[PDB]
Amino acid sequence: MKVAKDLVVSLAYQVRTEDGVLVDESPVSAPLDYLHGHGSLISGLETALEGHEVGDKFDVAVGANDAYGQYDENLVQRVPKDVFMGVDELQVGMRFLAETDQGPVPVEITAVEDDHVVVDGNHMLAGQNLKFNVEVVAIREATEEELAHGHVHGAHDHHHDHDHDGCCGGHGHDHGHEHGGEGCCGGKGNGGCGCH
């Protein structure tokens, strides 16, 4: 059999960013069981797991192409100036407006290239391709209720589900209350006060 959608599969995997950082890692003694294709792990990883082997380890790259970056390939378009060379100013970086079938798509030349120019938005928040190894441990199908809530042998047994509140995690509301610890004994008193 081969791993596929609608099939709970516990596969541990370690992910690491090119910067040399580890976003998450699953040990073999504790594989994360979930519905393949639609369970939790980014789809780029689920689809890449389809057709592999139970108990086999494999490496799959998935981040900006379909995971955390989600680069928008529908916004990048390379075309020569033959379609436009009189916009009151043709230079790399300038902002242009292309009306593709998807509607009005704003573009911005970033660097002209032979054959045609290159226009795109900003990838600073995208193009984050990460590399992580995955290892399938089991492959089973969930029942109607298991695939309904997207869980395997649990559904109701599963812990809570986004029900708590009041927590923040961010910051910027209030800052600087009493400087530091107690008022501390400082204030002023030049002249002497026993010094070096």
Side-chain angles (χ1 to χ4, degrees), residues 57-137:
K57 162 177 96 260
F58 173 51
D59 298 323
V60 163
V62 173
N65 172 214
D66 244 290
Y68 296 94
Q70 313 174 295
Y71 192 49
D72 242 311
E73 223 204 70
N74 267 114
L75 176 48
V76 309
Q77 235 161 9
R78 273 133 264 210
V79 287
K81 63 202 204 230
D82 299 27
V83 74
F84 77 124
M85 248 231 279
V87 191
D88 204 304
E89 245 181 35
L90 253 292
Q91 165 186 13
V92 184
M94 164 189 93
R95 254 192 240 263
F96 191 93
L97 276 112
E99 196 236 19
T100 73
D101 267 335
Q102 320 205 237
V105 194
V107 296
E108 166 174 57
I109 39 253
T110 180
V112 68
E113 221 177 15
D114 210 279
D115 321 323
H116 48 71
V117 177
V118 185
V119 89
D120 200 335
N122 314 282
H123 69 271
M124 307 242 65
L125 62 125
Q128 225 136 54
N129 55 333
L130 265 68
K131 46 171 218 249
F132 61 76
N133 312 328
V134 164
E135 315 173 20
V136 173
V137 190

